[PDB]
Amino acid sequence: DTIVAVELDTYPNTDIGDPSYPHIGIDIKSVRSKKTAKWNMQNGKVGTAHIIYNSVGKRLSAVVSYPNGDSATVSYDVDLDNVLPEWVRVGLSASTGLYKETNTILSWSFTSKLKSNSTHETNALHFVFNQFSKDQKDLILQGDATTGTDGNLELTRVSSNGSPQGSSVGRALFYAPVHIWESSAVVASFDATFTFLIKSPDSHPADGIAFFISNIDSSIPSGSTGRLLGLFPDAN
Amino acid sequence: ADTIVAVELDTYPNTDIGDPSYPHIGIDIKSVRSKKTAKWNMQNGKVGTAHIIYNSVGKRLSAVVSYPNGDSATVSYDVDLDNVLPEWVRVGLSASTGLYKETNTILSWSFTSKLKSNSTHETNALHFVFNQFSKDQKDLILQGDATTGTDGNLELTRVSSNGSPQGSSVGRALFYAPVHIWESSAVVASFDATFTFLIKSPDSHPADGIAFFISNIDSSIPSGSTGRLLGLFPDAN
Amino acid sequence: ADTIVAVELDTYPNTDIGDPSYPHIGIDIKSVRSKKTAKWNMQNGKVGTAHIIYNSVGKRLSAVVSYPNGDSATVSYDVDLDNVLPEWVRVGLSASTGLYKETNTILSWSFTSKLKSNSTHETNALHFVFNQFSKDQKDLILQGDATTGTDGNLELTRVSSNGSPQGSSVGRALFYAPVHIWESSAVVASFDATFTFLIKSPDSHPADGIAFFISNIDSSIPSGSTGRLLGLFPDAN
Amino acid sequence: DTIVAVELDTYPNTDIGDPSYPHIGIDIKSVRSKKTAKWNMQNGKVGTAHIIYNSVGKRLSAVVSYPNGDSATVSYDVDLDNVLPEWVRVGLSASTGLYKETNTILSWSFTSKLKSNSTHETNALHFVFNQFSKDQKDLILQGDATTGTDGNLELTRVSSNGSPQGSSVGRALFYAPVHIWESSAVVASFDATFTFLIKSPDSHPADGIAFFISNIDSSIPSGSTGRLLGLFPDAN
Ligand SMILES: CO[C@H]1O[C@H](CO)[C@@H](O)[C@H](O)[C@@H]1O
Ligand SMILES: CO[C@H]1O[C@H](CO)[C@@H](O)[C@H](O)[C@@H]1O
Ligand SMILES: CO[C@H]1O[C@H](CO)[C@@H](O)[C@H](O)[C@@H]1O
Ligand SMILES: CO[C@H]1O[C@H](CO)[C@@H](O)[C@H](O)[C@@H]1O
Ligand SMILES: [Ca+2]
Ligand SMILES: [Ca+2]
Ligand SMILES: [Ca+2]
Ligand SMILES: [Ca+2]
Ligand SMILES: [Mn+2]
Ligand SMILES: [Mn+2]
Ligand SMILES: [Mn+2]
Ligand SMILES: [Mn+2]
């Protein structure tokens, strides 16, 4: 797997290079973020994350914020054209370990826009989910991810009473592959937004939610529970 | 059987199954026998453009086909697309040839679906645009004879090495991801589609046409859908 | 005189000028006397949402009004908007009070205009979204009593210091830039609009309503357009 | 005036800091670009320019390309939130001096998208012109700019026969002011595209076309003909 992700790291794993507080981070082929920023996760409130990148500027940026709480931002110079293949799948991942939290997605949108050296926009791909059904046929649900419960996407397993389980991992990839770079495109850009609700019975809720982009055939790596966020096969 | 709604660009008049006696555009609602047609000039060798548009409040599906070097034809039909279509569909382009033939080349195709809720937000939306097609076009499901050739184009029907089209061919391209055409909380559901195309033939009676269509998610080319059936329908009912 | 097309959210029944005997929504084509209405429940103190939608091929203007804590009303009318409207227009929100009153508060407003040509491209497009309004809202033309208050909202009609609405008020907000509603090369012309709003009143008979409207570029509040005339019309013809 | 512009500098003025070849440049309050790149202008062919920026990454980027010719790119790190006022007008400018060229705009689009710390997009402004009429009521035409001739925007004066005049300057601003930064926006982004046709009877056609963003009340500065591009009152 080839993975680029923006993580909402709610649990600090200092032994695998995480900062010692909850943080947001940009991950380029490693759980050890290339850049992080402190982030004050807020139990039981709706937050929003935004991701943005264009192929000329070559800087991947993210922002996470609470209306009535904290906010954080992070940016990293990388060219995704040398990282990511031409065809990718876009997705959301989340996990728990010993500690947990609901990893509840209320909404998710993604917008890829490819402008050509002509008048026309060569390619484009845009979706919005503000609600999720029990049979969400345009999402590939991996692991413990389920849709529909309360018109929501629950990436990690939640029991009937509404309490989260540990040792869970799950993801939701958009059904169609995304032509992230196409020939004849002069400018390739994308942005993403998701709104989420992290609830928990733990003092260090865990482990986080991530927006990712990967090879089309990406799947949950073996043992990627907990600190690995359902994203990486190891902590290198 | 498959459930089909489609706008047809019908190059060949099959009067014996209810086509008008000239090339036309039509709105097909579960039958190749159009509910509504309009006279249409297919300009051999020219790039044309079709636009489709509908909303769930108005319940009136409409299409326009134009050539930048010719004229325009339009057709509109009253129909409640949720009373025909299932909740989840796929969207596609189909085309066919029979005893008479033509290239059914797609230069570009876009589709925009928006469902609006009780609030400001969209419960749901999908939009794609294609302005070229490569060899391995991973976001399209190609059926029958369709290929994504290297002129950067999508060829729906079989074209030989020299570039001349073959008879008795059928091909389609479905967008990869299912489309959520109905959402229970959705108050206003709309979509529009556009495709540019080049129909070229050495024939003075080119056949058979191209169609934008919406179908059940598992739709596939019916057996015996060549020629006048446009790769859409298993018969002329 | 001004040329007006508007969807009205009419909170007060003026039976004596052809309103139904209940609150309603209506499509007004050059006259306050709606061509089509539907029964409508205005939920005092609640945020509602209106959606408007039309295209030039279908020629059927449609609207939906919903409360997330109530129900929905819809109205549709066949009308060719180029046979009513000039080439260039402005788009706006209007509201009024008369002897009876209500707050006519706008929380959000969007408008999307797209005109499609002979080719893949849009000859022309305009889209705006407002999800809040400041004190100096430079992309809106405010008329009469309208203010862009500091609750981040647009107040169309006069509200006193304590927050209770006044009678005998009229206000409007027009988007700054003219809209090119007709283009000669344009084959498909569509638009959709959405606004969220809060009508609040201490009255058990609140009045008068809010309207999304389209008008000549130089339109202004007609004299005597308070109350049942919704800031739109100079009389009840 | 406060001016941020991306220029398509077809004529080199080495005495005011231009490179010694035609170039594209990013201008931040000065005709002396903060960054330039060589650009092989191509007489009598349709080209396309793209501009892009977001307020998190804080990098303004541009690309100019010909289908059957040359292409160029330039990027500059700047925060436009400390440069540009909250309200702006967006526009196109072009000029001639002793030397000229048709400064013909075939199409122009702009897209401002403001995402909030909620689900919603706080504000947005998007327009597309692929054709231009003799009474283009949503453009403020300044100086010699005219619309309609051949469904086009001619920013600089062109005689009846179709040959360009020298000592001309003109611009077209979009009628509505643009709330480029609004409060409660978490991410502010914009992009712009214009396609153009530069034709000339000169070996060093002149002087260039620019996409700009300015204070709402911006107007052609006195003597901004020629090398100043209708943008700046002087060459500082
Ligand atoms: C003992 O730690 C476990 O739980 C934490 C937090 O849940 C994870 O980060 C880690 O990988 C383990 O699964
Ligand atoms: C003459 O009839 C045949 O050819 C026409 C035109 O190709 C088809 O429509 C039809 O199905 C038959 O195959
Ligand atoms: C009772 O009539 C008055 O009040 C109603 C409701 O406000 C208005 O519609 C009308 O124009 C008059 O001013
Ligand atoms: C003599 O130079 C003149 O013409 C060139 C190119 O047209 C301009 O750059 C310059 O400002 C002058 O107007
Ligand atoms: Ca961690
Ligand atoms: Ca036929
Ligand atoms: Ca009334
Ligand atoms: Ca110069
Ligand atoms: Mn981390
Ligand atoms: Mn037919
Ligand atoms: Mn009424
Ligand atoms: Mn320069």
Distance of CA D60 to the CA centre of its chain: 14
Cis peptide before D207, with omega less than 30 degrees from 0?
yes
Q: Which residues contact D114 (CB under 8 A, 6 or more apart)?
A: D121, D122, D123, D124, D179, D181, D182, D185, D187, D188, D189
| Joined tokens for residue C127 | 């889209």
- C197: enclosing H helix or E strand: strand C186-200
The three-state DSSP-derived secondary structure of chain C is: CCCEEEEEEECCCCHHHCCCCCCEEEEEECCCCCCEEEECCCCCCCEEEEEEEEECCCCEEEEEEECCCCCEEEEEEECCHHHCCCCEEEEEEEEECCCCCCEEEEEEEEEEEEEEECCCCEEEEEEEEECCCCCCCCCEEEEECCECCCCCCEECCCECCCCCECCCCEEEEEECCCEECCCCCEEEEEEEEEEEEEEECCCCCCCCEEEEEEEECCCCCCCCCCHHHCCCCCCCC
The neighbours of chain D, by the rule of 3 or more Cβ pairs under 8 Å, are A, B, C
Q: Of the ligands numbered here, which is closest to the C-alpha atom of C169?
A: 3
Size of the B and D interface in Cβ pairs below 8 Å: 3
Ligand 2 atom at minimum distance from B14 CA: 9
| Joined tokens for residue C152 | 């981040």
Expressed in angstroms and rounded, the spacing between residue B26 Cα and the centre of ligand 10 is: 6
Query: What residues in chain C have their Cβ under 8 A from chain B's Cβ atoms?
Result: 49, 51, 53-55, 57-58, 60, 62-64, 66-68, 72, 74, 76, 108, 110, 116, 118-120, 131, 187-188, 190, 192, 194, 196
* Torsion angle of C-alpha atoms A180, A181, A187, A191, degrees rounded to 10: 10
What is the C-alpha end-to-end distance of chain C, expressed in Å?
13
Resolution of this structure in Å: 2.5
Ligand 1 atom at minimum distance from A204 CA: 6
Say which experimental method was used: X-ray
Q: What is the DSSP letter of C147?
A: B
For the domain covering D1-236, report its CATH number.
2.60.120.200
Q: Which residues contact C170 (CB under 8 A, 6 or more apart)?
A: C94, C95, C96, C97, C144, C145, C157, C221, C225, C226, C231
- Most informative mutation of A8, A11, A16, A232 for ligand 1 (most atoms within 8 A of CB): A11
Q: How far is D143 from chain C, CA to nearest CA, in Å?
A: 20
CA distance D99 to D226: 8
CA distance C51 to C36: 16
**Candidates B64, B116, B118; nearest CB to C188:** B64
Among candidate residues A167, A233, A161, the one with its CA nearest the CA of residue A206? A167
Expressed in angstroms and rounded, the spacing between residue D34 Cα and the centre of ligand 4 is: 21
Q: Specify the pairing of strand A71-77 against strand B4-10.
A: unpaired
Distance of CA D100 to the CA centre of its chain: 17
Q: How far is A216 from chain B, CA to nearest CA, in Å?
A: 9
Expressed in angstroms and rounded, the spacing between residue D11 Cα and the centre of ligand 4 is: 8
Q: Which residue has the tokens 């609004």?
A: D182
CA distance C125 to A128: 22
Judged by DSSP in three states, D15 sits in helix
Expressed in angstroms and rounded, the spacing between residue D50 Cα and the centre of ligand 4 is: 26
Strand partners, B61: B77
The CATH fold assigned to B1-237 is Jelly Rolls (2.60.120)
CA distance A73 to A62: 6
Expressed in angstroms and rounded, the spacing between residue A25 Cα and the centre of ligand 5 is: 10
Residue of A nearest to D184 (CA): A67
DSSP, residue by residue, B43-54: -TT-EEEEEEEE
Q: What angle do CA C39, C43, C48 make, to 5 degrees?
A: 90
- Most informative mutation of B208, B223, B225 for ligand 2 (most atoms within 8 A of CB): B208
CA distance B176 to A24: 33
- Residue B82, annotated ligand binder? no
DSSP, residue by residue, B148-184: --SSS-EE-S-B-TTSPBPSS-EEEEEESS-EE---T
Q: Are A190 and A113 in contact (CB under 8 A)?
A: yes
Query: What residues in chain B have their Cβ under 8 A from chain C's Cβ atoms?
Result: 49, 51, 53-55, 57-58, 60, 62-64, 66-68, 72, 74, 76, 108, 110, 116, 118-120, 131, 187-188, 190, 192, 194, 196
Residue of C nearest to D86 (CA): C138
Residues at Cβ < 5 Å from ligand 12 ion? D 9, 18, 25
**D94 CB less than 6 Å from ligand 4?**
no
The neighbours of chain A, by the rule of 3 or more Cβ pairs under 8 Å, are B, C, D
Phi-psi region of C224 (alpha: psi -120 to 50; beta: other; left: phi over 0): left
Pocket-forming residues, ligand 2, beta carbon under 6 Å: B 12, 14, 97-100, 207-208, 227-228
